[PDB]
Paper text:
In this study, we used alkaline D-peptidase from Bacillus cereus DF4-B (ADP), an AmpH-type class C PBP141516, as a model for determining the peptide ligand recognition mechanism of PBPs. ADP acts as a D-stereospecific endopeptidase14 and degrades D-phenylalanine tetrapeptide [(D-Phe)] into dipeptides [(D-Phe)]14. ADP also catalyzes synthesis of peptides: for example, it can synthesize D-Phe oligopeptides from D-phenylalanine methyl ester. Residues from these motifs form a Ser/Tyr/His/Lys catalytic tetrad that dominates the catalysis of AmpH-type class C PBPs. This tetrad is also present in ADP (Ser74/Tyr171/His312/Lys77).
The crystal structure of the ADP (apo) form was determined at 2.1 Å resolution. The space group is P3221, and one ADP molecule is present in each asymmetric unit. The crystal structure of ADP consists of two subdomains: a five-stranded β-sheet flanked by three α-helices, and a cluster of mixed 310-helices and α-helices. A cavity for binding substrate peptides is also present near the active-site residues. Two regions, the Ω loop and the 283–293 loop (red circle), had higher B-factor values than the average value for the structure overall (32.2 Å2): the values for Ω loop and 283–293 loop are 73.9 and 56.7 Å2, respectively. Therefore, in this study, the ADP structure was compared with DD-peptidase. Three regions, the 132–144 loop, Ω loop, and 283–293 loop, have different conformations in the two proteins. In particular, the structure of the 132–144 loop of ADP is clearly different from that of DD-peptidase: in ADP, this region consists of 13 amino acids and has a loop structure (green), whereas in DD-peptidase it consists of 18 amino acids and contains a helix-turn-helix motif (orange). The catalytic tetrad of ADP is conserved in AmpH-type class C PBPs such as DD-peptidase7 and DAA9, and an oxyanion hole formed by the backbone amide N atoms of Ser74 and Ser315 is also present. Trp233 of DD-peptidase, which creates a small hydrophobic space required for accommodating a part of the side chain of D-Ala (P1) of the substrate (glycyl-L-α-amino-ε-pimelyl-D-Ala-D-Ala [REX]), is replaced by Met245 in ADP; this replacement creates the hydrophobic space required to accommodate a part of the D-Phe (P1) side chain of the ADP substrate. Initially, ADP forms a closed state in which the 132–144 and Ω loops interact.
Author numbering: 17 to 358
The structure:
Amino acid sequence: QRDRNSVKQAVRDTLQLGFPGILAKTSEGGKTWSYAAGVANLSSKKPMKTDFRFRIGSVTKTFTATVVLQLAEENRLNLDDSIEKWLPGVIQGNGYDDKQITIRQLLNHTSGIAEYTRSKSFDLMDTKKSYRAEELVKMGISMPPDFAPGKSWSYSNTGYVLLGILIETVTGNSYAEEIENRIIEPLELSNTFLPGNSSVIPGTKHARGYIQLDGASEPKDVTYYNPSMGSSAGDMISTADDLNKFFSYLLGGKLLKEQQLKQMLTTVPTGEAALGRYGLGIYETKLPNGVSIWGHGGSIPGFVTFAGGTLGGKHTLAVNLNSLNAESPDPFKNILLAEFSK
């Protein structure tokens, strides 16, 4: 049987890396467990609770990829189509060459399209600004390719913002409509939301979220933050339950059929103790013991998340912290070691 004390301990100690609070939930064999420590609110000291909603950030990428893959299954697009066929005139200038960029590459971050958040016109700490997706694309291509398509790996939100546009070009429906109609509604993910450019986290069932760019400063409350800077790369809100159910269905063969799931799990090297091997909106975290955890993290102001699971979908975890602490980018490593070892 699992030693849950070691998980509790690892959950609790994560706070000492400089976070207000933490929630996690695990499912294994259909046996669930819930964890929470620390506080939802640094000023009132109200406790973190396990069933809270949170901004999942880049875990959104896995939902977007899943839609793109269903579209491939239905013969509405091909992973190796060039994007020039779908979105001509978009990725150009600066030596970009769209005729060599494929849909597959956007999905696994090998396109070389530059990351819009490196632009000087981008400000993470602006908690208000509404961006249209095409503005983020243009911001990204304002900088030259990092490399030639397919020749290297580099994390690019720009590519996932582009994919959200693509989806709509393919079906006539917004990426949010597609995520809602294909994933949220059929899995009954009843605490999972696509907020657009609204800054609201709905309801009272969530914590305050914080950001701390520093260590030598107060964390700032950024609970209300405009998620349109993330779009189809990072805007979603969800819960530990809904994310467990999602990853368990995905990895257990219930959302993507075998042929598409195999493509999703075909990975490229990242070169990076950071992520491991990266697939289509999902990556492999390999533990010392030989265990592979497939899932994704997120990190958006207010909230740092990881969700994921074992191949076959029978063991998953989701975890969230309510602050973005730039000094501790990789906080979940011991939780995973406890929950998935041995």
